[PDB]
Amino acid sequence: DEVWDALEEVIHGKVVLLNRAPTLHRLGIQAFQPVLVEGQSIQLHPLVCEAFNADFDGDQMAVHVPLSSFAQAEARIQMLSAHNLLSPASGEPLAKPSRDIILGL
Amino acid sequence: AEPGIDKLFGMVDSKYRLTVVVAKRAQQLLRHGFKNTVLEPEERPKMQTLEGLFDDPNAVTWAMKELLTGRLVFGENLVPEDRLQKEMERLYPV
Amino acid sequence: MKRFARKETIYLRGEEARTLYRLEEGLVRVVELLPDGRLITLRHVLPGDYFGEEALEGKAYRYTAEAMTEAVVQGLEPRAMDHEALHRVARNLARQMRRVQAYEAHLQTGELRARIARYLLFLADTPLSARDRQGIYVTVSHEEIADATASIRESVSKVLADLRREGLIATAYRRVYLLDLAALEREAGSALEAA
Amino acid sequence: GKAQFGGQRFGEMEVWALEAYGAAHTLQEMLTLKSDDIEGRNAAYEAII
RNA sequence: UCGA
DNA sequence: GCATCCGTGAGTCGAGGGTAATAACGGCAACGGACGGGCCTTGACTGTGAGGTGGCTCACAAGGGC
DNA sequence: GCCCTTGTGAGCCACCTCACAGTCAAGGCCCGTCCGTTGCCGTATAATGGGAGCTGTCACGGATGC
Ligand SMILES: [Mg+2]
């Protein structure tokens, strides 16, 4: 059980890259700060589902680990999901309330 | 979102320059073992272990916070590389 | 089950004692290595003897076990032994206690010549021994004899040379032939427990 | 494939994504250290450990 | 032949 | 100037199982390879020898305890 | 009031600390020796022009052809 704590120590502050095919635009890949969870499933934030065109009918995603300090910097600054909220195409917001959120509000 | 990311983007004409500065500074910190930091003991980033608060292992966080302080100077052709490296190795050995 | 070659070690001092061993075939030595590099033979493990005893009480081996011949050993899990197995282990450990104490007495009994004769006669009753035309013999080096007679190689070689001049034994290729059992018996005085 | 203990394929479109992000060192990692650069991947593993 |  | 043929393209990522079948031969000759041994190049052991030198060897005359 | 264990002291006698030779043994190499496997020729009735095709795109750029 100590190696899991060690793994918690290792990934501290670091981010990973999530990708979904087909990757149509640059938001087909995004950076996320990983939170270790039990189970064999990757957990994705709802708001980014539109940019990935992702849904939960059995879709799969790939994870990548940026190794260098430079790569990590690039991922955390340029590629982070929270830093990309607007469409590079229309300039309109991409990460926005949808479905159930809209319903409730 | 990373803390003060908008202000960090403010400090640079290009986001990629911010990224380069952060990365290189992180390399400096890693190389010299954090003893060249511009941060104060109470400004040091912390991480919660089972034991308790310890120094944050992540150098990028350090570099970004340091940059946010303003105590760092970045630009082009500020100093020859060899001279910089040697003065750093003199002030903070390995 | 596992086979070991001559001079190969079964386990090392300070290493995890997870396995108890029983010698099925061959001859094993239990020894200790000093910082100064001197090697000392602490006890002889014969077929049927249990060794790696540290597995029964501690976490790591305290001494090194080295095969003196081609050896066949059986690995055992201490925690998985029944009444009968524990009985055999107890009895055998008692036997090895008696033999190691007798060996203790041997190491301090008589001059080097007597100790050497006694050790040769002891080895004559071990798997280290065999026989051909020249007579009964034992496959053992002078270094090992020194390690098991509380002395150093040089003096042992000297005494063996004396015995060669006297016609009691003959030696070649780490192989020593015992030509006169009676004379060696007289030199040793008291015999060493072989079982 | 999982059966060969294989790695994921980083294809043309993914490369396009990395280019669009302007993440040059990440892309370089994908093209070199994490793939067919032998000396590079050896030295990288050794450096990380 | 599948899955998205 | 306007039909016509030829060459080249035609989304990404991931998953699991499958692979063969065949009609021509002897008479020599000689390499190329398995084998049995003898000369080596060390590596692990014998067989001295010359210097020191510990600590067994071997009898005295009682001091404290029970 | 009688046992258990002590403190010197002089003198050898095997046993250990260097310093070196020779000595027996094992993978290793080369030899040649032999033997198995491989490469080559010669086969004289007459023989004398192949054989499997693969079919339901589709649109463009470019050479080529009346
Ligand atoms: Mg779906």
Tab-separated table of C-alpha atoms (C1' of nucleotides) in Angstrom, chain G:
chain	number	residue	atom	x	y	z
G	1	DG	C1'	39.671	-24.196	61.211
G	2	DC	C1'	39.979	-26.466	56.851
G	3	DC	C1'	39.002	-26.031	51.082
G	4	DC	C1'	38.989	-22.973	46.279
G	5	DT	C1'	41.489	-20.161	43.679
G	6	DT	C1'	45.628	-17.389	42.878
G	7	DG	C1'	50.543	-14.622	41.450
G	8	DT	C1'	55.275	-15.043	39.627
G	9	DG	C1'	59.129	-16.494	36.399
G	10	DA	C1'	62.424	-18.794	33.458
G	11	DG	C1'	62.810	-21.523	29.048
G	12	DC	C1'	62.057	-23.836	25.281
G	13	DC	C1'	58.985	-25.571	20.946
G	14	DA	C1'	55.616	-25.926	17.681
G	15	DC	C1'	52.919	-22.572	15.004
G	16	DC	C1'	52.060	-18.221	12.330
G	17	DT	C1'	54.006	-13.943	8.836
G	18	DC	C1'	56.638	-13.232	4.335
G	19	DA	C1'	58.394	-14.555	-0.154
G	20	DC	C1'	58.879	-18.050	-4.130
G	21	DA	C1'	59.165	-21.258	-6.553
G	22	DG	C1'	57.554	-25.590	-9.394
G	23	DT	C1'	53.166	-28.825	-10.204
G	24	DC	C1'	48.575	-30.786	-11.771
G	25	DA	C1'	44.371	-29.431	-14.403
G	26	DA	C1'	40.681	-27.173	-17.739
G	27	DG	C1'	38.861	-24.731	-21.236
G	28	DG	C1'	40.830	-23.366	-26.042
G	29	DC	C1'	43.041	-23.881	-30.597
G	30	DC	C1'	44.887	-26.218	-34.418
G	31	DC	C1'	45.542	-30.491	-36.855
G	32	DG	C1'	44.233	-33.914	-39.773
G	33	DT	C1'	41.519	-37.553	-40.187
G	34	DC	C1'	37.753	-39.390	-41.508
G	35	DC	C1'	33.288	-39.182	-42.961
G	36	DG	C1'	28.854	-37.172	-44.686
G	37	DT	C1'	26.930	-34.063	-47.389
G	38	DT	C1'	27.080	-31.236	-51.524
G	39	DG	C1'	28.122	-29.971	-56.566
G	40	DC	C1'	28.463	-31.838	-61.514
G	41	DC	C1'	27.960	-34.576	-65.404
G	42	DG	C1'	25.224	-37.638	-68.419
G	43	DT	C1'	20.459	-39.892	-69.670
G	44	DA	C1'	20.996	-40.813	-77.972
G	45	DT	C1'	13.350	-43.823	-80.341
G	46	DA	C1'	10.925	-39.025	-81.194
G	47	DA	C1'	9.668	-35.180	-79.116
G	48	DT	C1'	9.717	-28.216	-81.865
G	49	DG	C1'	4.488	-21.260	-80.547
G	50	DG	C1'	1.352	-20.387	-73.186
G	51	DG	C1'	-2.479	-20.140	-70.300
G	52	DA	C1'	-5.650	-17.691	-67.264
G	53	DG	C1'	-8.474	-14.423	-67.851
G	54	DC	C1'	-12.558	-11.063	-64.270
G	55	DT	C1'	-16.136	-8.155	-64.926
G	56	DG	C1'	-21.784	-3.174	-60.088
G	57	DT	C1'	-17.291	3.154	-58.793
G	58	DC	C1'	-15.895	7.868	-59.525
G	59	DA	C1'	-14.144	12.198	-60.393
G	60	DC	C1'	-9.557	15.008	-61.855
G	61	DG	C1'	-5.325	16.132	-64.032
G	62	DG	C1'	-2.814	15.543	-67.733
G	63	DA	C1'	-1.083	13.474	-72.654
G	64	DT	C1'	-2.549	12.022	-76.564
G	65	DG	C1'	-5.392	11.819	-81.116
G	66	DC	C1'	-8.775	13.503	-85.400
